[PDB]
A paper describes a structure:
Bovine respiratory syncytial virus (bRSV) is a member of the Paramyxoviridae family that is responsible for the majority of respiratory disease in cattle annually, resulting in considerable morbidity and losses approaching $1 billion per year. bRSV is genetically and antigenically related to human RSV (hRSV),2 which is responsible for over 3 million hospitalizations for severe respiratory illness in young children and the elderly each year and for which no licensed vaccine is available. The most potently neutralizing RSV antibodies identified thus far target the pre-fusion (pre-F) form of the RSV fusion (F) glycoprotein, a type I fusion machine comprising a trimer of disulfide-bonded F2 and F1 heterodimers, which is responsible for virus entry and membrane fusion. The pre-F form of RSV F is metastable and spontaneously undergoes structural rearrangements to the post-fusion (post-F) form, which no longer presents epitopes for many potently neutralizing antibodies. Here, we use a combination of structure-based design, antigenic characterization, and X-ray crystallography to translate human RSV F stabilization into the bovine context.
Furthermore, the introduction of interprotomer disulfide bonds (DS2) has been observed to enhance both stability and immunogenicity of hRSV F immunogens. The sc designs sc9 and sc9-10 differed only in two residues, with a GS linker replacing F2F1 sites of cleavage and fusion residues 106–144 or 104–144, respectively. The crystal structures of two pre-F-stabilized bRSV F immunogens, ATue51908 DS-Cav1 and DS2-v1 were determined to 2.65 and 3.50 Å resolution, respectively. The DS2 immunogen DS2-v1 crystallized in the cubic lattice commonly observed with hRSV F pre-F immunogens and, like ATue51908 DS-Cav1, its structure was similar to hRSV DS-Cav1 with an rmsd of 1.1 Å for 435 Cα atoms. Although side chains for the DS-Cav1 mutations were not clearly apparent in the electron density, partly due to the 3.50 Å resolution of the structure, the DS2 interprotomer 98C-361C disulfide and nearby sc linker showed traceable electron density. We observed the 98C-361C disulfide bond to cause a local distortion of the α1 helix (in which 98C is located), although the local structure surrounding 361C was unperturbed. Although none of the DS-Cav1-only immunogens were able to antigenically survive exposure to 70 °C, consistent with that observed for hRSV F pre-F-stabilized immunogens, all three of the DS2 immunogens tolerated exposure to high temperature. To investigate the effectiveness of pre-F-stabilized RSV F vaccines in bRSV-seronegative calves, we selected the highly stable DS2 immunogen (DS2-v1), which in mice elicited the highest neutralization titers (geometric mean reciprocal EC50 11,453). Remarkably, calves vaccinated with DS2 had no detectable bRSV viral titers in nasopharyngeal secretions.
Residue numbers in the entry:
A (entry chain A), B (entry chain A), C (entry chain A): 26 to 105, 143 to 512
Amino acid sequence: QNITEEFYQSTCSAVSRGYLSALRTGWYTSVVTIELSKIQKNVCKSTDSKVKLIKQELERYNNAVIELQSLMCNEPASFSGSGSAIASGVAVCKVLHLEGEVNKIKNALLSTNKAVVSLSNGVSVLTFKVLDLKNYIDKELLPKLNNHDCRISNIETVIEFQQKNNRLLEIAREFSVNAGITTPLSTYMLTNSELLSLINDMPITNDQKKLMSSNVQIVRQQSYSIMCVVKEEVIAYVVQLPIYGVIDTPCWKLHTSPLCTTDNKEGSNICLTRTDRGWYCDNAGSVSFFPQAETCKVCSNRVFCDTMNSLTLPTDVNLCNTDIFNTKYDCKIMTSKTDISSSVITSIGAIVSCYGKTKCTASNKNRGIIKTFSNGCDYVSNKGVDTVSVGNTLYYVNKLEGKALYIKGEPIINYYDPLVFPSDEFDASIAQVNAKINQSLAFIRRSDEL
Amino acid sequence: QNITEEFYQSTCSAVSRGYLSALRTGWYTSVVTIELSKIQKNVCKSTDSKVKLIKQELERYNNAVIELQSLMCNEPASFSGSGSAIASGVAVCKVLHLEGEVNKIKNALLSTNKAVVSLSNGVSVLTFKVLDLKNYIDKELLPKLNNHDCRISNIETVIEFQQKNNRLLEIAREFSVNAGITTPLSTYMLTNSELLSLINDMPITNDQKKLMSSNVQIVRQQSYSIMCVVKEEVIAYVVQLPIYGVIDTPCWKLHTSPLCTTDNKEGSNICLTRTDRGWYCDNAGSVSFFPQAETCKVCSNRVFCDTMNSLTLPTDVNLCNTDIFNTKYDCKIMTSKTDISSSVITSIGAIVSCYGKTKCTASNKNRGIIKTFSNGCDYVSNKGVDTVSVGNTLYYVNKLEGKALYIKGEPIINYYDPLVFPSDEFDASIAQVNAKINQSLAFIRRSDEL
Amino acid sequence: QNITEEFYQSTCSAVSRGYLSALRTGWYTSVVTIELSKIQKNVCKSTDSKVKLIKQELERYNNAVIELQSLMCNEPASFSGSGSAIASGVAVCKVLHLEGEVNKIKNALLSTNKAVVSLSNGVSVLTFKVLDLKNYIDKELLPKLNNHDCRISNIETVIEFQQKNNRLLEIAREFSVNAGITTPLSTYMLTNSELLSLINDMPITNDQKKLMSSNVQIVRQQSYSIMCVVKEEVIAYVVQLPIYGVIDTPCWKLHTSPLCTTDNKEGSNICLTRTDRGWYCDNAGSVSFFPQAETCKVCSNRVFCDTMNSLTLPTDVNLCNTDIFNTKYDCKIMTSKTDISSSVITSIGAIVSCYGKTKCTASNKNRGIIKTFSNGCDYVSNKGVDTVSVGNTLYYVNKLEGKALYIKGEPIINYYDPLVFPSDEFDASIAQVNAKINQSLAFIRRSDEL
Ligand SMILES: *[C@@H]1O[C@H](CO)[C@@H](O)[C@H](O)[C@H]1NC(C)=O
Ligand SMILES: *[C@@H]1O[C@H](CO)[C@@H](O)[C@H](O)[C@H]1NC(C)=O
Ligand SMILES: *[C@@H]1O[C@H](CO)[C@@H](O)[C@H](O)[C@H]1NC(C)=O
């Protein structure tokens, strides 16, 4: 009733079921501002111990401003091809290159720290001001020093200026090594207290807000931070947040391992494996498939993915899990005579493909080995199991507890004849190999009757 | 006259033209030094609030010096195989393991911060001294504390010593997690003010200097920082800068998408796609091709790549863009019966390969959908277009404005017979498939005349 | 007698021998604790320059504690599939979700900073307390401020509190961007002085301790740091250390390059290359093979790898280096008609595959070019050589000095007939291609006798 899993002996593949979706659908674009107090090198050289320390701590304020301005060639019109997810925010970086749009933003920021601004393109973008140093320099630092005859207040304005400017240092220190775009969204670019404020104000239901509130760090993983322009005493940069629109549909992850024969001599055995491994979720009737599991993040029962790196597949694709020889969907597989033992760790278990003189075993935490694996594709539920060894490689099984079901079946590699079996197929399918069988056997059928 | 692009309907491929090259040709090697004032634990235990704070801030000065010395096994003679770009700087890390060469460098640094040094190998390497603490400890910190009866000046020498030593902390904090080699060149290893000083002094023309001056962050992306030795009160480490020698030649990026038929039943259709996708540039007559676009960085009109991860190709390779059936160059393609819809975002447009009941569309910012795609390979210019949907996947098109040209043609997948079409070819070519056609048809031609 | 290498002309492959193993065998799990002094917002608003600075420096102490608590969904039961190396530490993160186990740990930490704790699962895990702020706030910060009528001592308790809390900031600043698991083990999570203390106390021989002591940074590369729970004024997180069990066996790295013919017209030549390239080491009789060299780290004579990303292979696999046509082990190769020039840098040399009008050369540091390469697969020892050019690509050879041996032989690509040669084989073998030859020639043998 929580997290289940079923292993198919016929196909040497396992499916872990019970997960819930949270797919990235849109890009919540937003801009954060930093007020500035641009002053030139009018320094009064009263070389005192309380004056030079502010000279050092403000020269870093100078290196961390002109540096952001040189990063202007990213990205007005570059990034050809991939990485097209930031193009929803690059549309905002291009708006900030327009006169009057910069000024129209500084308006509603000097009175409430946050407000929605109407632009030239008109996109309803929110605005923030996370650090204000124009109001800390032109009111606290400039008047006591510029016209009051070079009067430094004390030493607590040197430590506080260090901590009020430390946030700006570690941002230019981060943007310069990232060509203007950072990911994940580091706490320097947005602390935890500020992010939870922006999520409550997104054009989304109260449901998705609770999700991104208790799962903060996952929102960071799939968020960006682009650098636009620096002009008119304002630092302008855009941060993209994921808009989860496909939520609460079921998900399941497919696990596959090679399935070979053990009734031949050395390399005279034949193998096959199901290709399309990874995460599958329901996305309005059709099935969204995520090949590289590197784009999906798992958090307890939740699965967060980006639909950009996904193949869209029809609902009739679940048939490969049971009846792989169905006429509606043609299931993809690969074939080879390469006979190598291997193991695959799943959600609540492990698949073992043992072939040859390989020492394949599953061991227990306390009493050592508990099951020696014979040759062939086998599976074991993690109940009481902790480690699995295959030759000189040892794996640990995730001790997430769940109900694992074994589905016995005739391994479909036996339904094939080794003579007319394809030597190697990269990404073939059931129909493509039965056609290649009907092709190689087409010569033997119509030539030996002489 | 600025940035153009042309789509070939015959080949289901698009070429974006108008870019300008900037290829990494050489490795400007350089060494940066740090003077040290090695003092032993002769601490006067006058446990005062202004004494223990310097004890803490100098114990970090101790952890961040002995730590760099343990990182000596990288890289005197390791790194077998790949990563051979640092071998121009490792040649300098091996020179610093020689007596007398270390001393000969400390000479011209205590009087001008920078000078060229003749070595034992003799490579004209430049030298820098970005942070001097031997002159800040043995002159400011040591005399007031060691022999003046444990006399701490004040508290401004605790904050300034914090900021004068903070740079050393975040370097050993970075080298220890990077095994002695960091990339990109972080501002900790070299700030913006110091890098722009070294570029003006490189054995290059005034042209490449302006390039690396307005495109600083890109130079960082393709730069390294190796750790050599720590001895004789000196921290020694080498930083490699890219020497761009192939500059201002034209470049173009190739985009490809599957091209299939829609005149058969389910999987009875045939597909083909052009393999060699990516960046191409002119490099002295021949064409330098960059397969993994991850090694190329785009900055407006400029394209920066590393010629180490490039295939060198003859000039007669541009023929695949137009006349793919040319006798001079044999164009590479792959074939498959896999019929999956997909989209490819280009520079100023998007290619759509729509097959089956897939919902393929291009949508507008304001008025929603503007063109439904039929089955087959199609292209759309980004003029007024903003998004493209393929099933459950949505892409954003780069709104870089340019002149896109459509080149209509007969899709070459129709010139093939589905019976004698290769089931799957990984990286074949026109000649290799016409030979395999002339092979499969060789049996049907000389056996049915009975 | 130190580092050797031999190139096989018959196979266009080189083997670098003389390296010594250090394979990751087990996971030394350990937990580090941080005592806390949880106080609520009972701040006395005596807005003084020495009071507000501690308010700022302690509000960061608040953001860096509640932030770690939201990262609780990683990883109680997630991470489906890959990344199963932390499951030895996740077993400890699951123990910390149990009442009484948290309290039983705080015992032996308030008196000796370190002791072994018996748990509910009972795993003998060590414990540490690297930073104590419960004893710095409830004894130094709380009594002077809470009940002594809001009395701030001085300003040296603001700088020291900055440096005593700076370590906690850059950890939550690192865990939040890493979803609770960081790698490599940064010095923030464990400084050099503390790591060398834990290695001396591992259930290992005195040998492996010296290894991980002079090779510290490599131990960091293959170590993790998981985040468990935050409760009862204690920060709990687990760090995994590698247990090297397979040590001091010989290792060798295989290098391969395409081997083609130069006796045909354009693409009428045939090529083949040995597939399984990378690191091989001895692991109890059998041979542990590491395909992706990205999992192996080289440090002088030592080679550190993780046996999780390794194929286990029989001892009879060294035969492919000499007699590739042996009956005991079937050597894997790939074939293609693609005739592209390329070079491969090895340990103490370089392999060059020169084909077509490609300009292939090896150049010297002083006197330029020293050997022009003819068409075919050739090798050169690094004695006096520094660079190798292939078309527009230039490589640097590692100037590690050693004894390179040339083993001349008949290139095995000539023993094949171009008519019945496979157009392309992804990962075939000698037997699989001789069978495909015995298949294509099976028709010509039994059909032309008419
Ligand atoms: C193979 O050919 C037979 C006729 O001999 C036919 O009945 C069968 O359906 C064919 N199979 C495929 C997969 O085309
Ligand atoms: C295929 O064979 C025919 C002869 O029947 C020949 O004219 C043609 O050039 C051949 N094509 C190839 C690609 O070899
Ligand atoms: C190929 O067939 C011949 C018989 O004509 C046999 O002697 C030889 O061993 C076979 N080779 C292979 C690799 O099967």
